[PDB]
Amino acid sequence: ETTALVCDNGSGLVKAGFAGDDAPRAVFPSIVGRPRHQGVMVGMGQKDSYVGDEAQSKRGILTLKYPIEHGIITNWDDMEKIWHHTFYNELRVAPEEHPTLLTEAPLNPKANREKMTQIMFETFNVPAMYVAIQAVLSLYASGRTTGIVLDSGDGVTHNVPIYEGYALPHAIMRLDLAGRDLTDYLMKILTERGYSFVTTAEREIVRDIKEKLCYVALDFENEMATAASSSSLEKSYELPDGQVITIGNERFRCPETLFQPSFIGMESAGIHETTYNSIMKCDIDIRKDLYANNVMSGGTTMYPGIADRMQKEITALAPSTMKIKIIAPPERKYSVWIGGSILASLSTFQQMWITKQEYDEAGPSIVHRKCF
């Protein structure tokens, strides 16, 4: 094989690139844009639809949509469109000569596996492919053979304890809370300041607001109480149109939703209660290392100071008889891609791909038979 392609079709962002490298030449938000204004001006070739960085650049007129929601896919036509974009525009390589690696969260419905694999088969006629779980690559990038992980993304947050090459399937749970819900709650709390954001184009600027002007507190009640003298925490954000935004306690309130999901009408365990329950449900002989072999990955964990709060909180829930550690690599956002590239870089992985010859007689159902 000449080269191997790996691609993680994340809910918000899509990461793709040749295996065995470090810089992804294909990273861009998973956006399909369509011109909302029916009235058009004759000439200049008004495109039927826009996808990718072009769509983001012309976000002003279009009505942008996310093909992936909560991880499930609803816009399979947009899926083929964005896959075509990825394969041809910014890679300049014919898909039918290289294998592809695919990823998704655990507990994904089987029909999703079937449809994604089947379209990979016919629509592109790529030589071979493999599909696995994101957390596997997240751990394999770090070169660690055992340790629980927390893969928080734009639309999926799941915890996957990992043993020496295996895992306890009774111990993996996936939480729907992610960057999308964080954005929604950020909108609902910024409606206080008089700032209004309803259009999807305004969602794309609310996302930037969250990315650049947010942080995680260490003791929410105490810092909210001391925020009564809101002078050292309020900052200034420059909206694209030209005015200014005086963000306040909401700069730290919105990421707190991860710790307390009771603020978004989600009667669910917090981001630390899920970890505590997952480890407590694991084996007693591995509670010790699972207490201090947790890592961070994905784009959601880019919050400054979230690592210290998470560490202290899981230490508080855990018994104090033993030490607790946290792992926060400064490349949590591309950890899944790096793990995929590393796994595809394995000297003996070439025989775990699925070429044409299996599907020529087997069918799509065999992916659950061997691929996982």
Partner: protein, 387 residues
């Protein structure tokens, strides 16, 4: 051969073909019926039954003039039919059956006017093609720009339309019911202040030329009130074509003030700059720079001396007062650029001429005679589904 383009403006008529640059012929949209009054009425050459166009405006002394178009719409249509007949039969003297014509129309006109204008153009002439376009998109074509808001001020009505990257925001088109005609009427009233009376019909064109030659837009209100209150430098002397001279003072800067302060002519609508600001502000947050960064003046009524500078200063000031709430910290971070091309008067014609060969050689883009007759008035939907 080449398709014909027609711009039947309220106060003027322009006509030409594709690939042209300057209007081939321009002439007021006037119809002259013969009349005898207390004048000398020299028999120069002859007085025909109905005289229109350049001959009408030249012999205007001996005839009464009626304007077929008012407020951007045609009031009486027989006179306008006479106008098309004149333009096609002697202004260009080429009247084939089957040629392609590209018409123009301000945005929010009544459906009946456009429908029956197209019906007349089809049945009475038999042209094989038709297309009606907004003056704003033609003004946008004139400079070749793609994104930006263009304002068109003419004799009949002033309208503004924002367009961002080859997409016309049909729900934010503007319509300000103050134009050159209202300014001329206010000028007549302001001259009636002093004692001069212009109640004839030729006097309307006389005072129109007076406002053309003398009136100017102020840049600082208080400064000009001081100038007209303490100094006599603003006085100008104008001699009528009849040969009589009158004195004009504060009228020079008070005539076009009605565009910026429509309450002078009893209009509740906001001024030019305020209406532009509201139109730009109502748009989405993303395109607001490109709306501000590219404002293109167009039309004859925008040729007022010192208008672009006043517009730019006033829009910056109003942004400062309305957004910053008096804080001068962020004022130097604003980019507004008003376009002042020399031919913004004929920008509509230039855009029409460009669009004539932009979409030529393919009749399946516009309406044909057969399609019109077999799909009735409702056939006139291929042009544009504007609101």
């Amino acid at each position: 051969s080449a398709p014909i383009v027609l711009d039947n403006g309220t106060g003027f008529v322009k006509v030409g073909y594709a690939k042209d640059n300057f209007p081939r012929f321009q002439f007021p949209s006037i119809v002259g019926r013969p009349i005898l009054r207390a004048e000398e009425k020299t028999g120069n050459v002859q007085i025909k039954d109905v005289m229109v166009g350049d001959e009408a405006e030249a012999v205007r002394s001996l005839l009464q003039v009626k304007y077929p178009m008012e407020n951007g719409i045609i009031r009486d249509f027989e006179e306008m039919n006479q106008l098309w007949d004149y333009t096609f039969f002697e202004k260009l003297k080429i009247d084939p059956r089957g040629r392609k014509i590209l018409l123009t129309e301000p945005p929010m006109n009544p459906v009946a006017n456009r429908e029956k204008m197209c019906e007349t153009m089809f049945e009475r002439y038999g042209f094989g093609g038709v297309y009606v376009a907004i003056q704003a998109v033609l003004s946008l074509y004139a400079q070749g720009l793609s994104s930006g808001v263009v304002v068109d001020s003419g004799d009949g009505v002033t309208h503004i339309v924002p367009v961002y990257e080859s997409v016309v925001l049909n729900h934010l088109v503007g319509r300000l019911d103050v134009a050159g005609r209202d300014a001329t009427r206010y000028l007549i009233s302001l001259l009636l202040r002093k004692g001069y009376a212009f109640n004839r019909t030729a006097d309307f064109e006389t005072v129109r030329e007076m406002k053309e030659k003398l009136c100017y837009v102020s840049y600082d209100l208080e400064l000009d009130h001081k100038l007209s209150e303490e100094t006599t430098v603003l006085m100008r002397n104008y001699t009528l074509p009849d040969g009589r001279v009158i004195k004009v003072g504060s009228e020079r800067y008070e005539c076009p003030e009605c565009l910026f302060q429509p309450h002078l002519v009893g209009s509740e609508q906001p001024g030019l700059s305020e209406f532009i600001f509201d139109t730009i502000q109502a748009a989405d947050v993303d395109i607001r720079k490109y709306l501000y960064r590219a404002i293109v003046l167009s039309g004859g009524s925008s040729m007022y001396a010192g208008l672009p500078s006043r517009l730019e200063k006033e829009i910056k000031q109003l942004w400062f007062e309305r957004v910053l709430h008096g804080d001068p910290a962020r004022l130097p971070n604003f980019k507004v650029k008003i376009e002042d091309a020399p031919r913004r008067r004929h920008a509509v014609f230039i855009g029409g001429a460009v669009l004539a060969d932009i979409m030529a050689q393919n009749d399946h883009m516009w309406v044909s005679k057969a399609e019109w007759e077999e799909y009735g008035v409702r056939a006139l939907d291929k042009l544009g589904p504007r609101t």
